[PDB]
DNA sequence: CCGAACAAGCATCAGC
DNA sequence: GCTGATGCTT
DNA sequence: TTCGG
């Protein structure tokens, strides 16, 4: 946290513009300014200093020079005091809530958590469970807790059929000391990209998780993403643990690696990743890597055969997931 | 100067 | 119902 | 907001 100062600025800003301006490169851009600014391994000194790090250009540079200079940004300092921005801000960190249903909340005269909590009747699903859980939410999860937890779901999981694979991915997978919820890989033989075998796979290890109550609510649900709520189970006479977001996502058990790969991250690694992708003609997502032809449409996938062997297609020395947390 | 900026699953809605 | 756009999310 | 052609 040698800038510290500055990458939380960067961040309050991006939170702004994605939240309040709804201007999402203007968000990106602050986003992959604070990220190379994290791992920038010197106390920056200067605008000019940071201007040299790609993601950093004139705009951002001027802001670092008046935040080194003040300690502050008169840019935030009044965003702060905008009661609309205050609302809005405060709205989409529920869940469910985004840029446009927080701005549509206040025009109604829905703009704290009070208000949200006698009008559960207009929020969906989705929204009413992120307010259920609103505080809980913002809590970290101590890696100890993550180890009691892919306990669970990894014994749950073997219960249901011992050809499973789940796996936990996310900054606990890079190896992080707390996480911000568990995100679960699931594959399964019957499952691959030349056919369904079996139906209900998904489905069948959410209700064996339900069963046992560590899942206990829904966010959404299909047949390959799971967006849902646990709780670990607590001892007699102790506090409960706080509820936590549980991300379930079913590959194609063929596509394990590029699965992995994307369920591992960071989101800015990752984006950062398949923006070099594109710039060497190829296209990544979550189940493959394809060439681009000559007029720029994907191509056949390319055999994979390892994590290392995607880096390789984009002539990227291979990186170890703790040094994917960008 | 100016076009591109990662990629996609689920919920929800409008239009036919 | 189906299709496609949009919102929200990973 | 930044980058690259
Ligand atoms: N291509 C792409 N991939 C994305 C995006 N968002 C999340 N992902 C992928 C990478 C995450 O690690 C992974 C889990 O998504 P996540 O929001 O749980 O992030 P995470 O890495 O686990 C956070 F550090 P934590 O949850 O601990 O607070 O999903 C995205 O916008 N684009
Ligand atoms: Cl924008
Ligand atoms: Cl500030
Ligand atoms: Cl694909
Ligand atoms: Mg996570
Ligand atoms: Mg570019
Ligand atoms: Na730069
Ligand atoms: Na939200
Ligand atoms: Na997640």
Redesign the pocket.
């Known amino acids: 946290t040698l800038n510290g100062g500055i990458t939380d600025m960067l961040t309050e800003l991006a939170n702004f513009?994605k939240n309040v301006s709804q201007?999402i490169?203007?968000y990106?851009?602050?986003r992959?300014?604070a990220s190379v600014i994290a791992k920038y391994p010197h106390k920056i000194k200067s605008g000019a200093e940071a201007?040299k790090?790609?993601?950093?250009?004139?705009?951002?540079?001027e802001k670092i020079d008046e935040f080194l200079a003040t300690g502050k940004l008169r840019k935030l300092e009044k965003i702060r005091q905008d009661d609309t921005s205050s609302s809005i801000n405060f709205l989409?960190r529920?869940?469910?809530?985004?840029?446009?249903?927080?701005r549509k909340f206040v025009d109604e005269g829905i703009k704290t958590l009070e208000d949200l909590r006698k009008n559960e009747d207009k929020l969906?699903?989705?929204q009413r469970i992120?307010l259920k859980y609103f505080g809980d939410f913002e809590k970290r999860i101590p890696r100890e807790e993550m180890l009691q937890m892919q306990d669970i779901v990894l014994n749950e999981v073997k219960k249901v059929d011992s050809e499973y694979i789940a796996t936990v991915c996310g900054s606990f997978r890079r190896g992080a000391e707390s996480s911000g919820?568990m995100?679960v890989l699931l594959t399964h033989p019957s499952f691959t990209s030349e056919s369904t075998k079996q139906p209900k796979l998904?489905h069948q290890v959410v209700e064996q998780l339900q069963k046992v109550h560590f899942i206990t609510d829904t966010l959404?649900?299909?047949?390959?993403?799971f967006?849902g709520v646990c709780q670990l189970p607590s001892k007699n006479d102790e506090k409960e643990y706080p509820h936590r977001?549980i991300?379930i996502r079913l590959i194609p058990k063929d596509q394990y690696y590029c699965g992995v790969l994307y369920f591992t991250g960071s989101?800015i690694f990752?984006?950062?990743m398949?923006?070099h992708?594109?710039?060497k003609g190829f296209?990544?997502?979550?189940?493959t890597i394809r060439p681009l032809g000559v007029t720029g449409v994907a191509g056949e996938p390319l055999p994979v055969d390892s994590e290392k062997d995607i880096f390789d297609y984009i002539q990227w020395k291979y990186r170890e997931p703790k040094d994917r947390s960008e």
């Open positions: 513009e201007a490169h203007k990106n851009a602050y992959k300014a201007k790090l790609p993601g950093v250009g004139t705009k951002i540079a989409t529920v869940s469910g809530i985004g840029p446009s249903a927080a969906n699903h989705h992120g919820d995100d998904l959404s649900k299909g047949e390959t993403k967006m977001r991300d989101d990752n984006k950062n398949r923006a992708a594109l710039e296209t990544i997502n979550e189940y």
